[PDB]
Design a protein around this ligand. Structure first.
Ligand SMILES: Nc1nc2c(ncn2[C@@H]2O[C@H](COP(=O)(O)OP(=O)(O)OP(=O)(O)O)[C@@H](O)[C@H]2O)c(=O)[nH]1
Ligand SMILES: Nc1nc2c(ncn2[C@@H]2O[C@H](COP(=O)(O)OP(=O)(O)OP(=O)(O)O)[C@@H](O)[C@H]2O)c(=O)[nH]1
Ligand SMILES: Nc1nc2c(ncn2[C@@H]2O[C@H](COP(=O)(O)OP(=O)(O)O)[C@@H](O)[C@H]2O)c(=O)[nH]1
Ligand SMILES: Nc1nc2c(ncn2[C@@H]2O[C@H](COP(=O)(O)OP(=O)(O)O)[C@@H](O)[C@H]2O)c(=O)[nH]1
Ligand SMILES: CCOC(=O)Nc1cc2c(c(N)n1)N=C(c1ccccc1)[C@H](C)N2
Ligand SMILES: CCOC(=O)Nc1cc2c(c(N)n1)N=C(c1ccccc1)[C@H](C)N2
Ligand SMILES: [Mg+2]
Lengths: 123, 427, 429, 420, 428
């Protein structure tokens, strides 16, 4: 606005100067934080070693499924290895005495036929 | 798989004779030698009824038991005489008596073991013996007495294998002996616990089929054996022939027998006569079916009316179409639908083998578990109790070595069988 | 990978003999065993045959019967050349139309041998899959040995699935009254040891031939040719290697939603007699009670899994629009809770028929494997006879005879009752 | 920096096959040997997808897993056959079942360790492995079951590195197996906690893109793989080519995924089968051109990335890119600010002058999850074909334990139709 | 006296590489380092031949630092002064500060200590870095905290690259800037922001470049920076030393951010038009177009003003030109500080990169104003941040690497409070 300057220096390769126009009119870094950086590591090493113990989980549950199947399979084989030869040695004994029931009725039409000739050779 | 044949008693034997020569014809066997015939099947299933010996030769698997020479040298002297192996003949020498006891107790057990000895041979030789069959009279000792003993002694030895008989229920009319009722009831008893199937053949029938249905005046034991000879070929065929059944004998039984007592197939036949009577070709399939289903053509004297068929087999003979057979078969199940039982479902099955008998181009044979058989049983038990009345002829069994109670003890066992067949007009 | 056939029982064996015959025509093997294709040392059809020796192509089969007779007529008529004398076990005495006999009395004896001669055939196989058991429902060794086998195979062989082809028995071409007992017996012991089980109603087959083949009163070897064809269209998938249905699981993982419910209903497409049809028309046949495989009526039972097994000259482009109007014309008929099916299996291999047989060479054939709830119609139509007999102890004594238990009968009907129930229990929601 | 590739299952593998020969083309590699092409770029970022071996030679960083020989000898016998290192093939022999459990539990864990073994020795060789990608079906066991197992076992070993899959969501129409809904729901679960991004590819889409959009009657598993093969080259390019992106794979993920579940980019493509920029752009932003079976209209986009291809004026490209964001303005969320970034590389594909590919994280994807969970409960209903797993040693409740996981992933996708 | 440059992060490094290039041209140093007091302010007369920059270059991938040990200039630095670090920061602060930072920081910090040791009376540091984006925000933040500890008075000047949607790629941007800018601001002294969008803007209007490159933008920032640092390289009165930089520009500890404006950007191809008048270029400095941060200072109050002139100029001119920047344009001064205009004449004619985009000019001007409108962009960032965090938006990636849900809250908090101080300097 047409002002007057205050010359503030002249050296080899320059010159400065203020150019005041219309007067103004009056109106702790801390080192201890390196432990902050291994609290950051406090919470990573927690999270990662937990999506490790949540995962070293889905693992030996797989132990089950895998084998609590196998284990539930021979649960059948060695149920029906005797649902057989124990239902079938109840058979062997079951007939075998329906044969004897057959025959001891014979020695009885037979040890009856014998004693009534001892009754003929006496009449 | 293989069957032996026991054939004991004048009545048993003279049936057995006629049987053998008729089946021996079908297969074609010289009175001695081997095959002579332009057919070729025959021999598939000849295995079953003929154990074959050295040279050509074919010899029946037969045992002939009698309690006196007489009738053994009838066969050996008659038709197909020297066909049977010489020491398959088990001689008697002694009395027979026309008495059950002699045959079942004294003079029978006297022999018996020598019979068991041939049978043991043949069957122990027989590569897979399936069972025995037997033929014999029921009124008269050597057949009905020895045989019922045989069978009892046959089992026990052979529990195992299935038993089977054509037995000739005796009538008051056309018989020799006053006592037969006694003889009958005593074996009837024996049978009903030891056989697996028993073809009931009444001589009341057999004779009636000749005068009612033949105009045959003087009916022999000849033309009359003739029927049985035929009917027996009938029943046997499909264990001994085609390859359209296959007929285990056991299978054959299982599917025929509901209840382990009551195996009393009264049988029947298609055509008939022998002498100066014919057939004007006219055996038709229809006229062949409503004929093995007419009572007046039944091998026992029942009347498969009052009383209902448990099971019913029929086998058909003659290069004819079975496209008609089942259709006719059905027809009768509808036409006489009433008198089958419901509770065993498909209880009348039939099959067909196409090679006819001596003479006759077409033919049907009927096996038949009718409770109307109760008719037959009740007929003998009927005249028996009229004799055990004030105990007549019994003193021949009294002193022989039999008890008083014993008659009643098996007179009873029959009375039960009676009202079990009656207790099978069911629901 | 590999695949053993067991055929027990007269019916089993003859069905077998009449489809190993048809396999043989399909993969071009001359009777003696040698086939002039470059396809062997020892893939593709190695599922069923084994390159034994340097020339021959033996079936991986074992044949058991308890008489000789039937097994006998294999070592007779050419093909006599096809098997190993080992693989045919015969057994001297019959089962006599009776289960008890087959399972306990006569079975006992031969089972040990069979079981082991099977083990020979499983050993010349690297990764065996399962077994095909062909056997007769009713009837003796057919129900009774088969029952014992399975119990046992179930023990000796782990996962190894088991597929059974049952011949559900039919009054008209049977001889045996005692039938029902035997089927309701086995079918009970058998069902928890089986995986998927094709029933084949003799009556329905007899039916097809009387209608569709003009045969007056058809033979066994009449019926067997026909079943021969059907089985070969079911097993087709695993033999040529199929663009679908290619392994025993994802073959049947398809059909059986529930452990018990095995029984699919088969339907063969163009049965037509020598002395052709549209891709559309044959599909529209599979849904025709006439052409069925078990006598029933699936228009009223609900479908719960549907397969369509195509064989021959077909582009899927066709199969689709044909299906489209199976839905907009006929009876949809689906269960409450399973998609609306139609796994569709295309096999380019044209269907070969037995040379001087009854049927003609077709361009395309269809096969439809549906698991309907109406196939339990024949579960009762059997049940009922059994019921109406046992009610009087009818034939029982023959069983109690050989060695059985009055209550083992009770206890088997008990099972059908309960099954007849599950099959009813799958309707709607 | 370097990526290995796991390619498991008949569906997985036949995709992996087509992928590899198409990308192998772009770089120019002989069915065996080395470079043959007048281009020169190629080889900058060939480092990334190819671990190179002795002689000339280039060999993919690939592992091929299957639970049966069949489909492995398809590749080795087919197109670019003997390109992959002979023992990078992990054989199966056994069943697969078309069943999740077998692949994840029994027959799967049976192998697994031999897979981990190749992966360990490719990735341990790989000088700075940045992550893995995997291809596979979701309805059917060897892919969806073993793979979901693989990835679980792949993490844990490699937490560290980012995971990534093209998974093929099975449809009711055009499928083999009744059960797939079960297989899908079981892996969807698995994925949603172990992958970092997951390209959803519906076969309901893939097939639809051919019949409403291509007049090819009998669509194979061939022309249909062909799409995926293409779309997969699309997505990858700028980790494997220019130098105008640079695409850490992690960076790539961080800027694509807001919320750690829900990484479900439904993709899309420009032209189709065996192009102006406007007409190209209002084509990768049509649904009749999305890879998942959705309709990115019921569901606004979370974030959206597209790579363009062709020596063309991108002075036109953001001039059309903006345009979609304005003519379709409501359908991007506002609460993520510059949520549709794009870039352009100019070396075109096999054939084709101009092309573009679209990754999109749309909550409309909720529509595909809902759809599977829909025929699922409808099945788990009366505990249906479930017995095939029952018996494999799985749990009754373990199914409902994963049916639920999905009904949240539905209703969080639902929950991100929020407010400013 | 002396003066070290640290350039962290891809953007930083490239801005660096394109201005060490331009220092080089200006002081006539052939790439190899040999050139056939004064400018010792930046280079060190190491060995007998070469003229190494007193710089250290850090990035977390190689890639970018890698380009330097490739293209001539490969001869200019010491293999030591370029630190690379194997894995990326991935467009995320957390990673930069805490996870990947941790590891390399100890090395960098020390390789810097090498360069401060070959200096007798070091002044301060120039930290060039990207505002948004990963290592750029995070490492720089960790550096400063630490540099703040290892170096006492020793002032720190930052050149931030305030990030812009059009040429970015990263959505997560705002988070990262608001993050660093919080931790960073109490450890910094005066900080020149450079709004990418504004530079992109100049090139689209003033250079006729269709869609301008990074190395398009960098040449331009290269020019501006070299006009700001000019003062301390030639030693010409005004801003002789880093202390002064603040003493003139920052009246308040917090308020660092001055707005730069470069004068005659005109494109060769136009290199022969009767070039601009001492007047006209002054009358450009006050043109929102030619700004350096997208805002509008016609409505915010100025609170300290500097005019940095370079070239052929007698002050006689400067004056009357300023005179009618007053009596024509918007004065716009604060309640309580003179009416500015410290004016810096440097006789050294401005050199431009040879086959570059701009032309050799006779005079150029530079205007460093500390306006209160430059907090327009403090909110235009803030808003995105706000509207994202409101939905936890991308947060989990951070809580992921190790951070705190609340450290985010607490950083917006600071801007909220700053945005406030910047408002609280208007009138009375
Ligand atoms: N479909 C069909 N069924 C048959 C055939 N042969 C017999 N059957 C049926 O088989 C069922 C009875 O089973 P069988 O095999 O005959 O008897 P098995 O005891 O198992 O065998 P065997 O008694 O030794 O002959 C009946 O329903 C017959 O209809 C055949 O060739 N085809
Ligand atoms: N002006 C300018 N801005 C850049 C440049 N490179 C990246 N940017 C911007 O900086 C922000 C991204 O910062 P980057 O430096 O790329 O991130 P960084 O972590 O420091 O570098 P990286 O090691 O690649 O992660 C975005 O706003 C980009 O626009 C560049 O060369 N010049
Ligand atoms: N059809 C047939 N029955 C006969 C024959 N001979 C007798 N019968 C009848 O059968 C009964 C018993 O036969 P019989 O031989 O006297 O008994 P045996 O003591 O065993 O000889 C006789 O009473 C007759 O009624 C015969 O030739 N054939
Ligand atoms: N697009 C693509 N999908 C396929 C292919 N084969 C099968 N699928 C699909 O993936 C699902 C089953 O994949 P599949 O490979 O059979 O299962 P897996 O072998 O056990 O992994 C089904 O829904 C099919 O629709 C193919 O090769 N390409
Ligand atoms: C020696 C054994 O032979 C006999 O003495 N008796 C015998 C003969 C039978 C018979 C049976 N049960 N017993 N069953 C038959 C049947 C009829 C139709 C279908 C199937 C079989 C036919 C009549 N043949
Ligand atoms: C294995 C590598 O391929 C992947 O599996 N995942 C992958 C690839 C991306 C991608 C992303 N998010 N994920 N983002 C992209 C993008 C496009 C424009 C601007 C910035 C990024 C481009 C498409 N490439
Ligand atoms: Mg498959």
């Amino acid at each position: 606005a047409d002002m007057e300057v205050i010359e503030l220096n002249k050296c080899t390769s320059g010159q400065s100067f203020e150019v005041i126009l219309k007067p103004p009119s009056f109106d702790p870094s801390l080192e201890e934080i390196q432990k902050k950086l291994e609290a950051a590591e406090e919470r990573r090493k927690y999270q990662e070693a937990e999506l490790l113990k949540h995962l070293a989980e889905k693992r030996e549950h797989e132990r089950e499924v895998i084998q609590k199947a196998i284990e539930e399979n021979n649960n059948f084989i060695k149920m029906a290895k005797e649902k057989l030869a124990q239902k079938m040695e109840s058979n062997k004994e079951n007939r075998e005495a329906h044969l004897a029931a057959m025959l001891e009725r014979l020695q009885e039409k037979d040890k009856h036929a014998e004693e009534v000739r001892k009754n003929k050779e006496l009449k | 798989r293989e069957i032996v044949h026991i054939q004991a008693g004048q009545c048993g034997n003279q049936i057995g004779a006629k049987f053998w020569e008729v089946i021996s014809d079908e297969h074609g066997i010289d009175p001695t030698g081997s095959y002579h015939g332009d057919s070729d099947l025959q021999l598939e299933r000849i295995n079953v009824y003929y154990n074959e010996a050295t040279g050509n030769k074919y010899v029946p698997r037969a045992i002939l038991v009698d309690l006196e020479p007489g009738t053994m040298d009838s066969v050996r002297s008659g038709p197909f005489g020297q066909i049977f192996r010489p020491d398959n003949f088990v001689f008697g020498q002694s009395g027979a008596g026309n008495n059950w006891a002699k045959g079942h107790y004294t003079e029978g057990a006297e022999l018996v073991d020598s019979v068991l000895d041939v049978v043991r041979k043949e069957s122990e030789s027989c590569d897979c013996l399936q069972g025995f069959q037997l033929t014999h009279s029921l009124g008269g000792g050597t057949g009905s007495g020895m045989g019922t003993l045989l069978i009892s002694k046959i089992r026990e030895e052979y529990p195992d294998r299935i038993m089977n008989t054509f037995s000739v229920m005796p009538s008051p009319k056309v018989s020799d002996t006053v006592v037969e009722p006694y003889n009958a009831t005593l074996s009837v008893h024996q049978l009903v616990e030891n056989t697996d199937e028993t073809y009931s053949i009444d001589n009341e029938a057999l004779y009636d089929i000749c005068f009612r249905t033949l105009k045959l005046t003087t009916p022999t034991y000849g033309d009359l054996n003739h029927l049985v000879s035929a009917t027996m070929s009938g029943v046997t065929t499909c264990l001994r022939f085609p390859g359209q059944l296959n007929a285990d004998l056991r299978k054959l039984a299982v599917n025929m027998v509901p209840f382990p007592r009551l195996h009393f197939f009264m049988p029947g036949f298609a055509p008939l006569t022998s002498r100066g009577s014919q057939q004007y070709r006219a055996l038709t399939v229809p006229e062949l079916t409503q004929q093995m289903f007419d009572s007046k053509n039944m091998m026992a004297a029942c009347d498969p009316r009052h009383g209902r068929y448990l099971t019913v087999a029929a086998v058909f003979r003659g290069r004819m179409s079975m496209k008609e057979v089942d259709e006719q078969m059905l027809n009768v199940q509808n036409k006489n639908s009433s008198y089958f039982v419901e509770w065993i479902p498909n209880n009348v099955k039939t099959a067909v083998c196409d090679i006819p008998p001596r003479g006759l181009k077409m033919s049907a044979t009927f096996i038949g578990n009718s409770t109307a058989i109760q008719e037959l049983f009740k007929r003998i038990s009927e005249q028996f109790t009229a004799m055990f009345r004030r105990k007549a002829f019994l003193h021949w069994y009294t002193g022989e070595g039999m008890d008083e109670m014993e008659f009643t003890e098996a007179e009873s066992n029959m009375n039960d069988l009676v009202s079990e067949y009656q207790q099978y007009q069911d629901a | 990978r590999e695949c053993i056939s067991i055929h027990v029982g007269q019916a089993g064996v003859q069905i077998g003999n009449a489809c190993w015959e048809l396999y043989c025509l399909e993969h071009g093997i001359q009777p003696d065993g040698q086939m002039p294709s470059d396809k062997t040392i020892g893939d593709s059809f190695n599922t069923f045959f084994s390159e034994t020796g340097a020339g021959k192509h033996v079936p991986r089969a074992v044949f058991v019967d308890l008489e000789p007779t039937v097994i006998d007529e294999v070592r007779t008529g050419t093909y006599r050349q096809l098997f190993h004398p080992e693989q045919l076990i015969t057994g001297k005495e019959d089962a006599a139309n009776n289960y008890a006999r087959g399972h306990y009395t006569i079975g006992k004896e031969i089972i040990d041998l069979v079981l082991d001669r099977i083990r020979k055939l499983a050993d010349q196989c690297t990764g065996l899959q399962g077994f095909l058991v062909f056997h007769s429902f009713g009837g003796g060794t057919g129900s009774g040995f088969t029952s014992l086998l399975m119990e046992r195979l179930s023990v000796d062989y782990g996962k190894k699935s088991k597929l059974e082809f049952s011949i559900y028995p039919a009054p008209q071409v049977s001889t045996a009254v005692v039938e029902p007992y035997n089927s309701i017996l086995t079918t009970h012991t058998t069902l928890e040891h089986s995986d998927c089980a094709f029933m084949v109603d003799n009556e329905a087959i007899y039916d097809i031939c009387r209608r569709n083949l003009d045969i007056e009163r058809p033979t066994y070897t009449n019926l067997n040719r026909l079943i021969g064809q059907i089985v070969s269209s079911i097993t087709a998938s695993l033999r040529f290697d199929g663009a679908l249905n290619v392994d025993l699981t994802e073959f049947q993982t398809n059909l059986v939603p529930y452990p018990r419910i095995h029984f699919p209903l088969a339907t063969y497409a163009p049965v037509i007699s020598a002395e052709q049809l549209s891709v559309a028309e044959i599909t529209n046949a599979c849904f025709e009670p006439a052409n069925q495989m078990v006598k029933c009526d699936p228009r009223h039972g609900k479908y719960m899994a549907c397969c369509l097994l195509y064989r021959g000259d077909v582009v899927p482009k066709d199969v689709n629009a044909a299906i489209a109007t199976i839905k907009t014309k006929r009876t949809i008929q689906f269960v409450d809770w399973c998609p609306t099916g139609f796994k569709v299996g295309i096999n380019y291999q044209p269907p070969t028929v037995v040379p001087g047989g009854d049927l003609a060479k077709v361009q395309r054939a269809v096969c439809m494997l549906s698991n309907t709830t109406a196939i339990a119609e024949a579960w009762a139509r059997l049940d009922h006879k059994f019921d109406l007999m046992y009610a009087k102890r009818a034939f029982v004594h023959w069983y109690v005879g050989e060695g059985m238990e009055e209550g083992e009968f009770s206890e088997a009907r008990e099972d059908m009752a309960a099954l007849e129930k599950d099959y009813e229990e799958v309707g709607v929601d």
